[PDB]
């Protein structure tokens, strides 16, 4: 009873927060684009960011009406994946914007920012891979996949 | 008990989230339009986007007061449909905006974006079709459904009034 | 017990959502007006939109402190009516804004938008009528009024 | 039990909504003022609007820690009053803004708007009066009410301390 | 049980509202500053306002993980104090902004606004004093301090 | 029961507030940057601020699905740390902005502000250090902790599968 209650309240706080954040990032970004008016990057990015976020929101239009377990995990993962694509794209978006604001101003600064982004993107790209892998395949293989990737790390910290 | 409780808390988190997002997308889009100030497209889009979202918000003004099941599902579906049209129109809106911001600047970028929208747009249009199909069909079933509930309400006041003497 | 609990949680999610949306639409609209600077329309509209929304919010300042049933339904309906007037006015506002942005630019587009608004406004005007009618009169007459208007529709779909 | 529960959940939804709206109207107004950059009116209004709203927010900083009943109603009423002044000032603010945006443009529009505000303004001023009247009256009753509660708190620490030995 | 439940739900609605408002005031203010571009005042103010608010938010990062009573009241009061400093600073900020918008325009108006602020600031300064006094000292002294300050008022209303 | 309930409602109010604030600070900062359009500082700051906040938001994408205790505390701490870095970077961001807005205008004001930041910055850096220290240490403990939980999950599917025959 406490487990089903916790699961349901987790989908309910995930609904309310996915909604507020996807909507807010999308809106702030649209405004950020109109306010300033590699550019193929800028457009494909803004447009992709809003598209991916709207996808997540719709997945919150449809989880409400809806064995059951496998379908709910595929939908859940599609929502999580769309959302992660949105956070990543919002980061790329601010990179491309430092780029556009500083283009004819200072190249050193722009390049510096876009560069300091790489290590975080790696962690970001890492998870994006897990959610994508989890989407095509079944829980087991990805569960064992995950134990392998973690155990091969357990050997590194000890050596040091 | 847990089922009716979960259903009611789902309509309550759907109310609170439909409201916050419909209002936020609409407001942000209106501001985005005034800030830059194929164009027939831009205007019809902004205006449709705000109209469809206001529709959703009103459906959240009216689900609160509310056999009942069929009527509640139709209203629910009209809400889901208005909302989905809003997400689509918001996406269309950012396309038209890349279009307008980049028009005399770079055609390659704008076109590239507007194109990369297609695979996602398919999924959006797909669902929009299902939600539309559910509405047109039950236009019949529900109107009646609503008559039966309003009648039962006219009847519950007649019984509740027959005891006042 | 479940009924009184559901009624109370409905007034509580209606309070929280009326508040967030009335405030957000009002603020976004005020900003939309200052950012661009038939115009009598534009001013009367912006001003009416903010006034009607503030009305709803105040009705949320006063439902909190407060036979009881009839008074609560009149207040409820006044809140719903103020809110609906706000959604309508927000739509009119975006119409008038396409109008103002495109005036000396393209008349075809502006007129096109303001036109595509009519069928939705009808549905909007329709409900605005119900809430107004519900305000002056008592539940019964409007309940029967509603059964008549719906039954006269039951005859149309069958014929086709 | 249901009554005390409902009262407490009403102060909790009133806290969460007072906060979101007071903060949002204030922020939006400040931005609206800087964006355009009878004028003594414009400044006194913006400044009063933000001040009154910050007042409300602080009253939400202090209802959280809190005989008790009379004190809680006075504080509640000060919150409702600050909030209502904020709604009024926000309305006044958009009037003065139609005024300023349209000043050298069209006087007819600005005046028309500012006029159409009157019937609604009456209802706002009406309630503002009631909330004001409740405050001035109990300035007496409550101060004392608060002394009795703070004393009982000074006394509950003295009893709670008499047992430590 | 009802008391511990109410206390916990009060810290939970205080968390959610401190967060939304501190974040919103800080963001709106940052934007208000960039949009317009005694000035030492303007900068020290904007900067202090954002700093004090971020302080409150962090205190909401750390109340979540955490005899217990005395520590929780010191943290609580530090949060309340940071928050109050934020509301005050937001008011000062709008004063300084009327000041900056009207400087070369109309001095009468600016001075008028900044002046009408004083009586509210007094009430604001008053509470800021209570929360600060409550921070260095223990509950008792400030409780009695508070009974003295209130009783000396009970003598004024009667005389009139 | 009350303890596990309180813990779960604390992660739920922390989820909802981390989300609203991380998203709002990030969006507001991006807009603040485009609106004005030592500068290497300005760019690295804005970009770091948005990156660290997006990190926090994602940690709220993943705490929802989730021995378990140690893993949940590490994830919790990574969230608290990303969030705190965001508050710091937002503060740094408004400093750099006083700097940039006032650069060719008044150096006294900008410098004054940027200086008055120091005592608060200390408290922020202080906590940032503790949260960092907790992470580096348990890099060991947790990885293992997560292996034990994922294994137990691989084992609970093997038992749940041994009964299907
Ligand atoms: Ba501008
Ligand atoms: Fe809630
Ligand atoms: Fe909320
Ligand atoms: Zn009779
Ligand atoms: Zn003693
Ligand atoms: Zn087998």
């Amino acid at each position: 009873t406490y487990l089903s209650w916790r699961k349901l309240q987790l989908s309910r706080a995930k609904l309310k927060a996915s909604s507020k954040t996807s909507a807010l990032l999308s809106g702030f970004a649209m405004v950020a684009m109109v306010e300033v008016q590699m550019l193929i990057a800028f457009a494909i990015c803004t447009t992709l960011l809003v598209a991916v976020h709207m996808l997540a929101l719709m997945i919150s239009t449809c989880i409400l009406p809806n064995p059951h377990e496998r379908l709910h995990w595929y939908i859940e993962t599609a929502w999580a994946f769309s959302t992660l694509l949105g956070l990543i794209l919002f980061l790329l978006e601010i990179a491309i914007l430092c780029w556009v604001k500083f283009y004819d101003l200072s190249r050193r600064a722009a390049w510096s920012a876009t560069v300091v982004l790489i290590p975080v993107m790696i962690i970001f790209m890492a998870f994006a891979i897990h959610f994508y892998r989890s989407l095509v395949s079944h829980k087991y293989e990805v569960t064992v996949s995950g134990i392998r990737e973690l155990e091969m790390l357990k050997e590194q910290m000890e050596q040091d």
Side-chain angles (χ1 to χ4, degrees), chain A residues 5 8-9 11-13 15-36 39 41-63 65 67-68 71-100 102 109-110 112-138 140-147 149-151 153-154 156 158:
Chain A
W5 173 273
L8 186 147
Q9 297 270 101
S11 276
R12 168 177 140 86
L15 200 160
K16 285 225 224 162
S18 166
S19 301
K20 321 317 180 69
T21 78
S22 290
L24 272 180
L25 294 162
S26 296
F28 272 122
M30 166 183 281
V31 165
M33 170 194 266
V34 314
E35 294 283 354
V36 297
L39 290 100
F42 190 53
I44 296 173
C45 195
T46 296
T47 291
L48 271 180
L49 167 160
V50 173
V52 125
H53 277 302
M54 297 309 95
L55 181 59
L57 290 179
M58 171 196 78
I59 295 179
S60 305
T61 280
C62 85
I63 280 190
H68 190 297
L71 181 59
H72 182 259
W73 197 74
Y74 272 21
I75 297 300
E76 167 98 10
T77 302
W79 167 79
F81 182 57
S82 314
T83 293
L84 186 40
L85 273 156
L87 304 169
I88 289 189
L89 287 175
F90 190 77
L91 187 43
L92 216 71
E93 184 86 7
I94 198 57
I96 313 312
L97 268 190
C98 268
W99 220 239
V100 171
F102 296 27
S112 205
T114 280
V115 153
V116 188
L117 278 183
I118 191 150
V120 190
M121 298 267 344
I122 296 308
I123 290 298
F124 271 95
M125 214 56 59
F127 281 107
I129 286 314
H130 181 258
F131 284 120
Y132 184 81
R133 274 190 191 168
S134 278
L135 257 158
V136 194
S137 63
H138 64 311
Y140 193 77
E141 182 182 331
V142 131
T143 298
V144 174
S145 277
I147 298 181
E149 287 177 315
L150 283 187
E151 213 165 273
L153 197 172
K154 179 188 164 288
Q156 322 276 308
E158 306 190 49

